[PDB]
Amino acid sequence: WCSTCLDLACGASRECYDPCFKAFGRAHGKCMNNKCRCYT
Numbered sequence: 001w002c003s004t005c006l007d008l009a010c011g012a013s014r015e016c017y018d019p020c021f022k023a024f025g026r027a028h029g030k031c032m033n034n035k036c037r038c039y040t
Contacts, residue, residue: 002037004029010036 004024010016010031020038021027029038 004038004040005032006036006038008036009034 006016006019006023006029008016008019016029016031016036016038017027020029020036024038024040026040028040029036031037
């Protein structure tokens, strides 16, 4: 299926930016399936 995906339901940039930047490293992802999917 996927890999760089967070269990956080998108809806707010900072909400998915803080985690994606602290989990994967860089803040660069999108909101797919109502969930923020970080990609590079």
